[PDB]
């Protein structure tokens, strides 16, 4: 196929990249000269600006880092593909997240928010809110998380309705944020409401972690009511999602699946091929494995001994 | 001009009868007169073909269709033949466009040309027919008829989406991109033998992802959302897991990056971004070959395999060469080359010792079949004036005893210069592709 | 050297292997016949008793899952409808 991008621009950008390991003051001027000589839109200059932010964040240079990020925000909506742009931006957001200047983190976030609003790119503005939302749940903040959830929900009404038919993808993130919200609060009334609202309209392509979290709440709700088949199914998918992603809660979710599997009065073994293999011999799961072995063998004396021992 | 004249005749007749006669005076006269005038004139004028119904629709006369709809609606059995003639014209237009005879038609242009026809007819329906249900039913039924005619069509359809997704320059705004693909699947619904279409659709979505990244992301999830809304589970869910495994790849690397932050890696592992996918969604390319690995990647793969077998026990990895890329730093300046995990073995042997031939790379490499030849020719055969692997017996065909050299090619002064001629004839046509079909 | 590799972006595929275990319906093993083949039939001549692989990547004896499909059809390890994607190992 081939397509002549530019001969001079790529040379000068990588020349500055070769000078990155040298003194930045000469390199950053060289990167700026690339941007001035960039002229036409800067797929390479976008990389140069991305590298400049990475370099400046090393030597604690925020003032122009966000000002050039605003240039990147305008650079998002000109030529660069959405896939590369938000992957670059997500890496920028993750790279800023490395330090602990949380004030600068959210100043970066709020500048990101309104910029993506302008170019009708609420797709990434939703993702940044989800990125900011997940961070909020980790440190238990709800004052602005609720505002985010309302704004994300506000972007999701089709005026008369409260949901779209393609933003069911978005409602996955919205409810997953709310699932973790009421996990700490232990609000069973909202937990079922979230799950019921989720189930019907969430039908879409989810992120594996989101699906596992949604199903994990459903298994808890079903177990707290009495349904064993539904709780077992929800724990099954949540553990399946955890395996693909790699969340540490997979072992804890497996314990949920084992208990639900034993509660439905079925001799079926909930390890099989789904629960890999080594998880049977895991020290935190070996006690559960012994419970399954005693449950299948109907050894009440051995079962009760394991209950008291562990 | 007759339709305007008869409309005026009705208007003056109804005006006279309500003002010069008694109060009601309208039911018997109007119905019989309207029925006779409309029935005979419509039949005799469409045979004449002198700017009748088919001609006044071909040139795009919005007013003529609008006045015809508002007049023929009063007489029963008028819309029935109106849609029948409209469907017949659509059939004639469809056959002249879905014609299969003649090779050399662009699949992207074929759908796009037909796509404009659907939008043009929809615009006429909205502007003139006032969104009549009968007209919508007939065009929907007609579109179901002429779209599933040819056999070689699901293959062409999947290529149309591939062109749209590969590059978005044509209509940079996502609204134009999404509209083209929105009503494109309207054509998809009117297609029987979905199994053969799915298999073609499975294969090319891999082809979209396995060459270059940075397609769209956000709309890629969006176009998947419409996919599950319209098709079903079994064949489509496999696709939705492929892009899901792409998310699995980076998330698995997020854990791998955490290990990179904790433990520093030596020269075997300077700069690695490995990827982890599941075989349950991503099909095998051709055979998952078993070629050799350069020593620096050998250590990197060994470290990753050891890490994956220690902290991620319960699954073992299989190495392959028909996937990925690399950045080969060459060295008057230092320009980094690019090899898509095909020439890495060939260049590594050259670094160990130059002046090799086809026999050298086929005896001490455990190299697969002609896919080597197609990969080998990516550096020598069919190359522009940016050659990174030259030979003295320059020929299109690849012989056995030919020596390879290297050229500077300062015309390729690009510190990261990429070789995009890797594909070339990878998916060639005729040799052994039709016989296995 | 003249050419040195700095970056590499290979893709490492993983597949659940050593899927030997137990046909959970028969509780004997993934192979070595089933309860309907070691306790039920005695002749076992011109017989088969293969494995049965589904869309959800689960594995059972062909005899065990087919008989389980009489009453229920929901793959008792989940709520999936258990399409039949393969037979044998
Ligand atoms: Zn069995
Ligand atoms: Zn059997
Ligand atoms: Zn299953």
Using only C-alpha atoms, what is the Rg of chain C? 20
Interface contacts (A, B; CB < 8 Å): 89
The two tokens of residue B380 are 């020598």
Q: Distance between CA atoms of B125 and B139, rounded to whole angstroms?
A: 10
Residue of A nearest to C30 (CA): A272
B57 phi, psi to nearest 5 deg: -90, -30
Return the residue in A205, A213, A277 with the most chain B beta carbons within 10 A, the one to mutate for interface testing.
A205
The response to whether C17 counts as a known ligand-binding position is no
Of A14, A123, A245, the CB nearest to B218: A123
Which chain A residues contact residue B243 at CB under 8 A? 205
Is residue A11 within 8 Å of residue B414, measured between CB atoms? yes
State the smallest CA–CA distance between residue B406 and chain A in angstroms.
Answer: 21
Is residue B198 within 8 Å of residue A179, measured between CB atoms? no
| Dist. CA C41 → ligand 2 center (Å) | 9
| Dist. CA B347 → ligand 2 center (Å) | 54
CATH fold of C1-87, please?
Herpes Virus-1 (3.30.40)
Is residue B374 within 8 Å of residue B425, measured between CB atoms? yes
The response to whether C58 counts as a known ligand-binding position is yes
B416 at interface of A, judged by CB pairs closer than 8 A: yes
The two tokens of residue A268 are 């079926």
| Dist. CA A217 → ligand 3 center (Å) | 21
Contact criterion met (CB < 8 Å) for B271 and C83: no
Q: Distance between CA atoms of A215 and C23, rounded to whole angstroms?
A: 27
Contact criterion met (CB < 8 Å) for A276 and C16: yes
Contact criterion met (CB < 8 Å) for C58 and A272: yes
Which chain B residues contact residue C84 at CB under 8 A? none
Which ligand has the shortest distance to the CA of C61? 1
The residue with tokens 């690399």 is B326
Cβ neighbors of B232 (< 8 A, separation 6 or more) are none
Contact criterion met (CB < 8 Å) for B336 and C1: no
What is the helix (H) or strand (E) element at residue B330, kind and residue range?
strand B326-330
Domain boundaries, chain C: 1-87
Residue of B nearest to C3 (CA): B330
Contact criterion met (CB < 8 Å) for C5 and B304: no
B314 at interface of A, judged by CB pairs closer than 8 A: yes
Is residue A178 within 8 Å of residue A194, measured between CB atoms? yes
B40 at interface of A, judged by CB pairs closer than 8 A: no
A264 phi, psi to nearest 5 deg: -85, 10
Residues, Cβ < 5 Å to ion ligand 1: C 23, 25-26, 34, 61, 64
Q: Distance between CA atoms of B161 and B184, rounded to whole angstroms?
A: 8
Q: Distance between CA atoms of A1 and B418, rounded to whole angstroms?
A: 12
Helix A168-185 with A188-201: angle, nearest 10 deg: 170
Experimental technique behind these coordinates: cryo-EM
End-to-end CA gap in chain A: 65
The response to whether C29 counts as a known ligand-binding position is no
Is residue A219 within 8 Å of residue A226, measured between CB atoms? no
A142 burial type by CB count under 10 A (0-12 exposed, 13-18 middle, 19+ buried): middle
Contact criterion met (CB < 8 Å) for B329 and C6: yes
Please tell me the number of Cα atoms within 13 Å of B260 on its side-chain side: 15
Please tell me the number of Cα atoms within 13 Å of B42 on its side-chain side: 20
């Amino acid at each position: 196929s081939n397509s002549e991008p530019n001969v001079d621009l790529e040379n000068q950008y990588y020349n500055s990249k070769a000078l990155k390991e040298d003194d930045p003051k000469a390199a950053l001027s060289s990167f700026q000269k690339v941007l001035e000589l960039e002229g036409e839109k800067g797929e390479w200059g976008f990389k140069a600006l991305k590298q400049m932010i990475k370099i400046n964040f090393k030597l604690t240079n925020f003032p122009e880092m966000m000002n050039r990020y605003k240039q990147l925000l305008t650079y998002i909506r000109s030529a660069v593909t959405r896939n590369y742009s938000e992957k670059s931006i997500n890496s920028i957001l993750d790279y800023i997240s490395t330090s602990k200047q949380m004030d600068l983190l959210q100043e970066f976030y709020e500048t990101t928010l309104e910029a993506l609003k302008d170019a009708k790119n609420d797709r990434l503005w939703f993702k940044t809110n989800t990125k900011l939302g997940k961070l909020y749940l980790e440190r238990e903040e709800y004052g602005k998380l609720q505002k985010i959830l309302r704004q994300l929900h506000q972007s999701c009404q089709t005026d008369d309705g409260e949901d779209d038919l393609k933003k069911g993808t978005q409602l996955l993130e919205i409810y997953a944020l709310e699932i973790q919200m009421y996990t700490a609060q232990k609000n069973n009334k909202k937990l079922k409401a979230l799950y019921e609202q989720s189930l019907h309209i969430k039908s879409a392509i989810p992120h594996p972690l989101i699906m596992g979290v949604i199903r994990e709440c459903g298994g808890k709700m079903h177990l707290r009511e009495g349904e064993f088949e539904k709780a077992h199914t929800d724990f099954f998918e949540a553990f399946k999602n955890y395996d693909e992603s790699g969340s540490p809660r997979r072992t804890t979710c497996l314990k949920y699946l084992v208990l639900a599997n034993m509660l439905m009065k079925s001799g079926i073994n909930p390890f099989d091929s789904q629960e890999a293999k080594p998880y049977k011999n895991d020290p935190e799961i070996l006690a559960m494995t012994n419970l399954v072995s005693a449950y299948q063998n109907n050894d009440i004396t051995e079962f009760e001994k394991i209950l008291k021992t562990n | 001009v007759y339709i305007k004249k008869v409309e005026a005749r009705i208007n003056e007749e109804i005006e006279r009868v309500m003002h010069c006669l008694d109060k009601s005076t309208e039911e018997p006269i109007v119905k019989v007169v309207e029925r006779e005038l409309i029935s005979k004139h419509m039949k005799t004028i469409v045979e004449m073909e002198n700017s009748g119904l088919v001609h006044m629709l071909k040139n795009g006369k919005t007013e003529d269709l609008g006045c015809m709809y508002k007049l023929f609606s009063r007489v029963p059995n008028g819309l029935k033949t109106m849609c029948e003639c409209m469907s017949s014209y659509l059939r004639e237009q469809g056959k002249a466009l879905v014609s299969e005879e003649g090779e050399g038609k662009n699949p992207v242009d074929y759908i796009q040309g037909l796509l404009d026809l659907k939008s043009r007819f929809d615009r006429f329906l909205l502007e003139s027919f006032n969104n009549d249900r009968l007209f919508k039913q007939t065009i929907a039924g007609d579109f179901e008829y002429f779209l599933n005619l040819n056999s070689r069509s699901p293959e062409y359809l999947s290529l149309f989406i591939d062109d749209k997704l590969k590059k978005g320059v044509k209509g940079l705004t996502e609204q134009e991109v999404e509209t083209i693909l929105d009503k494109a699947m309207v054509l998809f619904r009117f297609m029987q033998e979905k199994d053969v279409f799915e298999r073609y659709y499975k294969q090319h979505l891999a082809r979209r992802l396995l060459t270059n990244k940075s397609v769209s992301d956000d709309s890629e999830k969006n176009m998947i959302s419409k996919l599950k809304t319209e098709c079903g589970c079994q064949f489509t869910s496999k696709l939705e897991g492929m892009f899901r495994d792409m998310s699995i790849s980076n998330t698995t690397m997020d854990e791998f990056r955490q290990h990179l932050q904790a433990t520093g890696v030596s020269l075997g592992g300077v700069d690695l971004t490995v990827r982890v996918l599941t075989t349950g969604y991503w099909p095998t390319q051709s055979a998952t070959p078993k070629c050799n690995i350069p020593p620096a990647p050998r250590h990197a793969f060994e470290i990753f395999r050891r890490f994956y077998l220690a902290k991620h026990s319960g699954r073992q990895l299989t190495l392959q060469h028909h996937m990925g890329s690399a950045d080969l730093n060459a060295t008057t300046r230092k320009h980094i080359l690019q090899v898509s995990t095909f020439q890495m073995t060939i260049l590594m042997l050259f670094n160990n010792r130059e002046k090799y031939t086809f026999e050298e790379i086929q005896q001490e490499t455990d190299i697969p079949e002609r896919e080597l030849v197609r990969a080998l020719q990516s550096l020598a055969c069919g190359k522009p004036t940016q050659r990174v692997l030259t030979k003295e017996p320059k020929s299109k065909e690849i012989e056995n005893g030919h020596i390879f050299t290297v050229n500077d090619q300062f015309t390729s002064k690009l510190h990261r210069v990429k070789i995009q001629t890797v594909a070339a004839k990878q998916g060639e046509s005729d040799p052994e592709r039709k016989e296995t079909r | 050297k003249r050419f040195e590799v700095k970056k590499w972006n290979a893709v490492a595929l993983w597949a659940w292997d050593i899927v030997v275990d137990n046909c959970a319906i028969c509780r004997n093993h993934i192979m070595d016949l089933c309860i309907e083949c070691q306790a039920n039939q005695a002749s076992a001549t011109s017989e088969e008793c293969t494995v049965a692989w589904g869309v959800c990547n689960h594995a059972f004896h062909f005899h065990c899952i087919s008989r389980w499909l009489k009453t229920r059809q929901v793959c008792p390890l989940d709520n999936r409808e258990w399409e039949f994607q393969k037979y044998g190992h």
